[PDB]
Amino acid sequence: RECDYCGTDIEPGTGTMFVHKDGATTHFCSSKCENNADLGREARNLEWTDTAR
Amino acid sequence: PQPSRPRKGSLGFGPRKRSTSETPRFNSWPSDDGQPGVQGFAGYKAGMTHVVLVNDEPNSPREGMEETVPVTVIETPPMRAVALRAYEDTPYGQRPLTEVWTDEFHSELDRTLDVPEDHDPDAAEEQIRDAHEAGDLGDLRLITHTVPDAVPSVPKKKPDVMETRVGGGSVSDRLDHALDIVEDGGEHAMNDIFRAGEYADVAGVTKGKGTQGPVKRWGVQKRKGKHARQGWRRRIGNLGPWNPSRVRSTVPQQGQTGYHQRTELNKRLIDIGEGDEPTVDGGFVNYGEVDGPYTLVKGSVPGPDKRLVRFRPAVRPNDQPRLDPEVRYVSNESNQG
Amino acid sequence: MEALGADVTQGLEKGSLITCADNTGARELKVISVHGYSGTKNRHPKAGLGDKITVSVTKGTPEMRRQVLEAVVVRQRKPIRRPDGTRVKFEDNAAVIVDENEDPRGTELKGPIAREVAQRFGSVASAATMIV
RNA sequence: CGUGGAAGUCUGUUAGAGUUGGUGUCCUACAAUACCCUCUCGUGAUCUAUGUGUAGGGGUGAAAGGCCCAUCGAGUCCGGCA
RNA sequence: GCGAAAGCCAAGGCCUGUCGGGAGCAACCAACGUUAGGGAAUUCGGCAAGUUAGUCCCGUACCUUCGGAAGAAGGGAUGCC
RNA sequence: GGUCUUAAGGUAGCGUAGUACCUUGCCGCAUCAGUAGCGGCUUGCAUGAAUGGAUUAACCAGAGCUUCACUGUCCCAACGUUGGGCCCGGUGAACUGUACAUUCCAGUGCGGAGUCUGGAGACACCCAGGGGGAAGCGAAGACCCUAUGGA
RNA sequence: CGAGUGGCUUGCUACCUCGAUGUCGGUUCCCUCCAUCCUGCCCGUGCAGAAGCGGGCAAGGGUGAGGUUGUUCGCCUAUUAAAGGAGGUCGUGAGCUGGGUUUAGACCGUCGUGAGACAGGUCGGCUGCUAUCUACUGGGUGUGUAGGUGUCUGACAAGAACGACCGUAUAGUACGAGAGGAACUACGGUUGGUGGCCACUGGUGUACCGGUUGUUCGAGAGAGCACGUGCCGGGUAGCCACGCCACACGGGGUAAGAGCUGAACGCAUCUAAGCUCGAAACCCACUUGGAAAAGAGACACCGCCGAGGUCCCGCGUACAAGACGCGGUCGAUAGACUCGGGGUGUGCGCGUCGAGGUAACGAGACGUUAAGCCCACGAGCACUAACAGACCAA
Ligand SMILES: COC(=O)C[C@](O)(CCCC(C)(C)O)C(=O)O[C@@H]1C(OC)=C[C@]23CCCN2CCc2cc4c(cc2[C@H]13)OCO4
Ligand SMILES: [Cl-]
Ligand SMILES: [Cl-]
Ligand SMILES: [K+]
Ligand SMILES: [Mg+2]
Ligand SMILES: [Mg+2]
Ligand SMILES: [Mg+2]
Ligand SMILES: [Mg+2]
Ligand SMILES: [Mg+2]
Ligand SMILES: [Mg+2]
Ligand SMILES: [Mg+2]
Ligand SMILES: [Mg+2]
Ligand SMILES: [Mg+2]
Ligand SMILES: [Mg+2]
Ligand SMILES: [Mg+2]
Ligand SMILES: [Mg+2]
Ligand SMILES: [Mg+2]
Ligand SMILES: [Mg+2]
Ligand SMILES: [Mg+2]
Ligand SMILES: [Mg+2]
Ligand SMILES: [Mg+2]
Ligand SMILES: [Mg+2]
Ligand SMILES: [Mg+2]
Ligand SMILES: [Mg+2]
Ligand SMILES: [Mg+2]
Ligand code: NA
Ligand code: NA
Ligand code: NA
Ligand code: NA
Ligand code: NA
Ligand code: NA
Ligand code: NA
Ligand code: NA
Ligand code: NA
Ligand code: NA
Ligand code: NA
Ligand code: NA
Ligand code: NA
Ligand code: NA
Ligand code: NA
Ligand code: NA
Ligand code: NA
Ligand SMILES: [Sr+2]
Ligand SMILES: [Sr+2]
Ligand SMILES: [Sr+2]
Ligand SMILES: [Sr+2]
Ligand SMILES: [Sr+2]
Ligand SMILES: [Sr+2]
Ligand SMILES: [Sr+2]
Ligand SMILES: [Sr+2]
Ligand SMILES: [Sr+2]
Ligand SMILES: [Sr+2]
Ligand SMILES: [Sr+2]
Ligand SMILES: [Sr+2]
Ligand SMILES: [Sr+2]
Ligand SMILES: [Sr+2]
Ligand SMILES: [Sr+2]
Ligand SMILES: [Sr+2]
Ligand SMILES: [Sr+2]
Ligand SMILES: [Sr+2]
Ligand SMILES: [Sr+2]
Ligand SMILES: [Sr+2]
Ligand SMILES: [Sr+2]
Ligand SMILES: [Sr+2]
Ligand SMILES: [Sr+2]
Ligand SMILES: [Sr+2]
Ligand SMILES: [Sr+2]
Ligand SMILES: [Sr+2]
Ligand SMILES: [Sr+2]
Ligand SMILES: [Sr+2]
Ligand SMILES: [Sr+2]
Ligand SMILES: [Sr+2]
Ligand SMILES: [Sr+2]
Ligand SMILES: [Sr+2]
Ligand SMILES: [Sr+2]
Ligand SMILES: [Sr+2]
Ligand SMILES: [Sr+2]
């Protein structure tokens, strides 16, 4: 699988899946990505992220 | 009428003091069933990783599916069974009779023992056989040591010596099986005793925490509410009633916590291999890199990284052996991050 | 009960105010008790995803309000562990009102459900719009 | 609408005065009444320095038997008195 | 900055609110920071802690001795160039 | 009862009250559940008119209750920060002490014993700890009675 | 109606303490009792089944959360297998709390001429001490057994290390007209307890990196202070729980009970001798401690002029002192360096753009730059430091 935020490959047997109000599903690879998302930041704007580079 | 509540902590792991030997000592051994064999082995704790595995359990609704299982990596290099000790049945229990040693010894065994220069392996063997004829022979155990030199992450070279029982067939056939292992040079591997998928009992001397209070050591409550601000936070209510006018040893008190011997029952051996397949990127934290004979134990194992853990075939298994589990994936991801 | 197929860290307690994920007329539910549970001294009785709980209706229609009904915990904020190691958490804490035979009191269910709840309570599944 | 700027008026760790809770700290104390935070008043029946007056069954008291030099339901000292 | 407020800094003063050295420095204690999910279930009692907060705009109930209630409540704004 | 004591015989109001014994009074509100709180009723053990009654805007470090918000008060505890604590140099008290004293379980005894009796246990010394016991230390009991005591 | 047991209630007595044995309730922590609430095994039934009622053995484990009330008690709610009762100075203030009783202030009602009173109500109203002995939890030093290293034995000791529930198959089956509706057994899970561990999720993380407010160092750069991080965002290692792993079956002997054989008493009889069974209870099994077990233990090797140990040195798998463990050049023990593995989030400077502005000036944007900075982990690497050397000892 791939992280719906940064874009790196989520190591199997790791990570969290956040289920939104409408039913949408967001797989995260780490807490760092979850926290950046909660801050309202979009992955495209952060240079360390694979979705950006 | 004041609610009931189970006591704080168990009274069966006492006295909660520092262990005499850092090398664990089994107090029980498996029953004599099929073919003769050494009833144990030993390794050195490396660290932890996870494994994706295929469900072996026939009674599970998930039989055949991918399941993530936590695993403790333990480096298990070949050990040397340097002698055969024999016990005799005396009216005062089992007392050691004689020992049958070797000629071939490891270069750095002299760091622990006063290595034998002059011994008679035949007179010793004769004394043991005269005892078997008399019907006085108890059990047959092997004096065994580890080769920490084979493990680059463990600083020590000084071998950890421990006694291990040989059980199985008849007392005549296991005497012969024991003498064969010894007379060669004593070299045996994890494979000789264990097969992946079997249940083992891991014994180890826990992580030392020095002195800790009742809350950590016995799991007692902290002072609650208003009582927490008065000058008492982590101290118990009282040391006992007015009568008996003494403090009972059963009351939760401060002292040594950790560095105790524990024998963790029914641990599944996920895989026994050789190489660098379970090693973590950047190396196991506070340990190092694994590239040699290893064992993957399901879940946790007592003691810190670098500590000597002991293995023994489960004396009380609950489940039937489901041999050689299919390992789909082993994580090599850095333990830092 | 039947195994969930997931390890749950109970995110709710007795007295917790949760959402009512249905069209029964009940908007907010308050947890009173948890079916089959027995705690220990000083411990607040804990409820989590997949538990059958007893609730009181805090907010809603005059007829539904104040009623002591049984419910099933469908969604929770605190993570649960799936067999593949992955954690699954929700946006809110929610429950669906149920009857004596475990059939939903309402007709339509609002928001998603966890697949483990669906397998345990079948008639709640065959009413679920989204199953994650 | 503006002007005016009243008030035992309001906010306020301005100065200054006071002392609600923590039943915190201390409790052979830093201290025979202390420390910290919190809290109240702060243009008035306000607070304060100095000088001055009222003296013991007497003063003084917005009154608690409060206070009158760590002493008060009758100060202190010495005497009566062994 | 409203300010004899905070915080920071001059002038001036001081290192004398006058015993030091050592141990990632344990238990325990005093002061205190941060704690997932739940959110007063704690307790005689929200005690303790926390929440709110400056300024401008909008807007503001019952009651009332018409003075007040009232900063009711609630909502929005706020930097730099 | 349909007057009598002793002059009158409780009027407006308020009322289960900071006054109500019975009492958690009865009904209602609110809560899953409310000896609480508020409203109503109210025969008030033993309310009531400057011994002032009722009522009341505003004010309050005054007593009780409810809601929103908030949170380590709690579930249930964790990790961290500073000063101690611990070891070393220097300085250097006090409380307390009939004697003996390694105690424990029972018993006995002025009936609540480390010291008596019977057993059990017990090699000596030292370090740290939280305070079970010494009916621990501190104060010739402020309660109670007594004194041909005091004020 | 009669006979008793207990010592939880109440009453009685006045033996003990008035040169003081701190009063209720609560809390916290430990042990116990059985007259047993649940759980195990049983007997009876107005025992079809299911669900009950009553009784017996049995104290292993459990017996929980909440609303009013200071309450104990009790009433009430929802859960539960059940939400039993009692003793330990009505266990527990040199542990806590201080809501009630019961000081000094005040109010109300009643009583009193009055001061003032009340086994009436109400608001307010303080919690001392540096542990000598003993006791226990853990830690050391000596001596005894009588040179050393390593491995063991097991007298004794501790444990609840396990308790309980739900679900599925059995089975819509046995039973019953129907309604309704089991069990043996095999499985999956949950809960409480217990021990351990950190790959995973989570917390912390005043290591670290970044953003940013005020002020000071002229600006810039780069920094100090704002409580022991100014605040905000992220967060490695470690430590942790809210995370994860593990915690039988079976034997043996019994209780209540069900029986066999069997006599006294030709019969009968579970009992008198004998025997087969039979509880979550007892013993074993399992875990932990344990040569100071004074019968003070066993084995193997080394050594008595030398085995081994201590000091010393570099360090932690250890640690409050002490202790413990490892390494010491025949070396990777620690540091430096370089990689690897990680944290943060794109450095200074320069170039282009930039709303505008005559210009000066200019917040900011892009590139250089997966940049810069940083790391409590790993590897490589003898460069630096584990050197020199001392002592005890049959
Ligand atoms: C009426 O109650 C009191 O007076 C309590 C007290 O005053 C407490 C004194 C505490 C001190 C000052 C000695 O620390 C007192 O002296 O009690 C005595 C007292 O003080 C030592 C102890 C007494 C004597 C017999 C045991 N008992 C224990 C405490 C107590 C408690 C009481 C009691 C008497 C006692 C006595 O009346 C009912 O409640
Ligand atoms: Cl407490
Ligand atoms: Cl409940
Ligand atoms: K007394
Ligand atoms: Mg990690
Ligand atoms: Mg990760
Ligand atoms: Mg409680
Ligand atoms: Mg004057
Ligand atoms: Mg929280
Ligand atoms: Mg409570
Ligand atoms: Mg407060
Ligand atoms: Mg009322
Ligand atoms: Mg009149
Ligand atoms: Mg006296
Ligand atoms: Mg008196
Ligand atoms: Mg007089
Ligand atoms: Mg005492
Ligand atoms: Mg009985
Ligand atoms: Mg018991
Ligand atoms: Mg008591
Ligand atoms: Mg006490
Ligand atoms: Mg006290
Ligand atoms: Mg004290
Ligand atoms: Mg009161
Ligand atoms: Mg009072
Ligand atoms: Na204190
Ligand atoms: Na006491
Ligand atoms: Na005017
Ligand atoms: Na003050
Ligand atoms: Na005032
Ligand atoms: Na006088
Ligand atoms: Na009157
Ligand atoms: Na805190
Ligand atoms: Na004590
Ligand atoms: Na009796
Ligand atoms: Na008490
Ligand atoms: Na029992
Ligand atoms: Na109650
Ligand atoms: Na007492
Ligand atoms: Na006290
Ligand atoms: Na008490
Ligand atoms: Na048996
Ligand atoms: Sr052994
Ligand atoms: Sr043993
Ligand atoms: Sr206190
Ligand atoms: Sr006693
Ligand atoms: Sr004023
Ligand atoms: Sr007070
Ligand atoms: Sr102080
Ligand atoms: Sr004081
Ligand atoms: Sr405080
Ligand atoms: Sr003011
Ligand atoms: Sr005189
Ligand atoms: Sr200066
Ligand atoms: Sr000096
Ligand atoms: Sr943080
Ligand atoms: Sr409350
Ligand atoms: Sr409450
Ligand atoms: Sr606003
Ligand atoms: Sr009337
Ligand atoms: Sr102490
Ligand atoms: Sr006195
Ligand atoms: Sr009995
Ligand atoms: Sr029963
Ligand atoms: Sr009582
Ligand atoms: Sr009652
Ligand atoms: Sr008790
Ligand atoms: Sr009362
Ligand atoms: Sr009274
Ligand atoms: Sr009081
Ligand atoms: Sr001797
Ligand atoms: Sr069934
Ligand atoms: Sr049916
Ligand atoms: Sr600072
Ligand atoms: Sr702020
Ligand atoms: Sr029998
Ligand atoms: Sr010995």
Side-chain angles (χ1 to χ4, degrees):
Chain A
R1 267 195 163 279
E2 201 168 86
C3 181
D4 296 335
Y5 195 77
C6 78
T8 55
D9 294 313
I10 303 180
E11 174 76 29
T14 295
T16 316
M17 190 210 294
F18 179 67
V19 186
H20 298 253
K21 194 179 179 179
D22 60 3
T25 279
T26 310
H27 286 80
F28 288 107
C29 83
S30 57
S31 58
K32 187 188 182 177
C33 287
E34 300 185 52
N35 293 314
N36 277 84
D38 287 349
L39 286 171
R41 295 173 170 159
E42 290 168 14
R44 319 194 70 85
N45 304 290
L46 296 183
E47 300 179 66
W48 55 275
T49 272
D50 285 3
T51 314
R53 51 167 87 124
Chain B
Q2 206 175 125
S4 305
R5 171 223 55 179
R7 63 161 287 115
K8 309 299 191 189
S10 163
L11 257 13
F13 299 90
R16 243 88 165 198
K17 55 167 276 178
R18 287 171 191 168
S19 193
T20 298
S21 303
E22 196 174 286
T23 293
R25 310 296 172 180
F26 284 112
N27 82 120
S28 184
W29 294 112
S31 55
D32 310 315
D33 276 36
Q35 289 190 298
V38 197
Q39 296 183 306
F41 202 75
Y44 288 96
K45 190 174 169 176
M48 291 184 87
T49 44
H50 59 276
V51 49
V52 181
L53 210 71
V54 168
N55 199 289
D56 297 84
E57 203 165 51
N59 300 295
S60 173
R62 288 186 55 79
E63 189 191 13
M65 289 178 218
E66 290 202 329
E67 206 165 278
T68 305
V69 160
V71 112
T72 298
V73 180
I74 288 152
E75 290 210 73
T76 42
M79 296 196 311
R80 310 286 175 84
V82 288
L84 179 268
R85 181 174 264 161
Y87 288 77
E88 64 153 335
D89 289 331
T90 70
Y92 310 105
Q94 292 186 333
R95 287 198 190 193
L97 236 189
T98 19
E99 290 169 53
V100 185
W101 288 75
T102 36
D103 300 74
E104 287 176 55
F105 296 111
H106 186 248
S107 64
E108 280 165 327
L109 176 61
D110 58 318
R111 286 175 167 269
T112 321
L113 311 174
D114 278 324
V115 177
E117 290 190 85
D118 290 289
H119 183 56
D120 188 355
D122 298 290
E125 192 180 327
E126 204 182 304
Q127 202 175 317
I128 298 170
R129 292 191 134 111
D130 281 323
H132 186 1
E133 280 175 54
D136 285 320
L137 191 69
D139 71 323
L140 298 143
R141 315 200 200 147
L142 301 171
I143 308 293
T144 321
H145 78 261
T146 59
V147 184
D149 211 46
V151 202
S153 309
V154 178
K156 70 181 173 181
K157 297 159 194 180
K158 179 182 169 82
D160 300 333
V161 193
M162 63 275 255
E163 210 178 282
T164 311
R165 198 183 176 259
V166 184
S170 63
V171 249
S172 301
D173 275 321
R174 72 183 183 243
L175 212 175
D176 286 299
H177 180 66
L179 288 162
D180 281 324
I181 302 165
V182 179
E183 297 294 270
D184 287 316
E187 199 169 309
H188 56 297
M190 192 74 169
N191 304 302
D192 297 24
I193 304 87
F194 301 100
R195 171 114 108 115
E198 286 174 319
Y199 288 116
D201 291 337
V202 182
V205 173
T206 58
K207 300 184 78 169
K209 281 146 203 308
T211 46
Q212 307 288 318
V215 180
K216 183 164 174 66
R217 193 179 199 231
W218 297 94
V220 318
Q221 283 181 11
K222 297 204 310 173
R223 297 253 177 148
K224 300 303 169 183
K226 203 159 217 179
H227 311 298
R229 287 179 265 121
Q230 313 314 306
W232 291 262
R233 292 187 186 276
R234 335 188 95 238
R235 299 180 187 169
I236 66 168
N238 61 275
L239 294 168
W242 192 317
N243 278 295
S245 306
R246 54 189 176 85
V247 176
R248 246 191 267 260
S249 67
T250 59
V251 320
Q253 287 189 80
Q254 167 253 61
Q256 250 284 323
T257 106
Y259 204 75
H260 309 135
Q261 187 196 284
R262 290 295 180 261
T263 301
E264 213 95 59
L265 266 42
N266 304 333
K267 316 295 279 184
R268 198 177 194 223
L269 306 177
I270 298 300
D271 184 39
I272 301 164
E274 189 157 355
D276 70 329
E277 286 94 308
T279 320
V280 137
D281 284 324
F284 282 109
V285 197
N286 284 300
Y287 186 72
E289 295 184 326
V290 174
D291 192 28
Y294 67 88
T295 301
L296 299 185
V297 173
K298 183 176 171 188
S300 48
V301 149
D305 309 320
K306 290 165 182 175
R307 216 193 286 304
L308 178 94
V309 296
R310 274 238 263 179
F311 295 93
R312 157 240 265 178
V315 295
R316 42 178 282 190
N318 288 325
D319 304 314
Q320 202 64 67
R322 289 130 54 220
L323 307 169
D324 299 85
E326 199 198 304
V327 179
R328 289 271 181 90
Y329 182 67
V330 172
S331 190
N332 291 290
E333 188 186 36
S334 181
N335 278 348
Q336 305 173 79
Chain C
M1 293 202 273
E2 198 167 284
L4 269 193
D7 283 22
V8 188
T9 301
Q10 292 98 133
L12 317 179
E13 291 193 335
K14 173 181 190 82
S16 289
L17 296 179
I18 58 178
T19 315
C20 191
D22 61 18
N23 59 355
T24 50
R27 295 184 180 182
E28 195 187 63
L29 298 176
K30 173 201 289 170
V31 190
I32 295 177
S33 295
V34 183
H35 193 85
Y37 187 85
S38 181
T40 191
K41 186 190 162 194
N42 299 323
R43 185 172 286 179
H44 298 357
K46 53 181 182 188
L49 192 128
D51 286 304
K52 193 168 77 183
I53 61 168
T54 307
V55 285
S56 73
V57 181
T58 308
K59 296 173 176 181
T61 57
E63 295 283 294
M64 279 304 272
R65 254 187 273 127
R66 289 205 52 75
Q67 282 193 66
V68 176
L69 303 156
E70 278 178 53
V72 160
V73 194
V74 156
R75 302 194 285 278
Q76 73 167 48
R77 280 191 181 101
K78 189 69 192 170
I80 64 163
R81 186 182 56 95
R82 287 213 160 134
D84 75 321
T86 313
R87 302 292 149 128
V88 181
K89 63 181 184 180
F90 298 78
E91 187 267 338
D92 74 326
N93 307 298
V96 169
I97 304 173
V98 122
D99 69 14
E100 193 189 73
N101 296 299
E102 288 169 10
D103 298 306
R105 194 187 151 98
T107 345
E108 296 165 352
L109 303 192
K110 301 172 185 170
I113 291 203
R115 64 161 94 120
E116 292 94 2
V117 186
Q119 191 237 127
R120 188 177 255 182
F121 304 101
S123 56
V124 180
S126 55
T129 320
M130 293 155 255
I131 283 167
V132 189

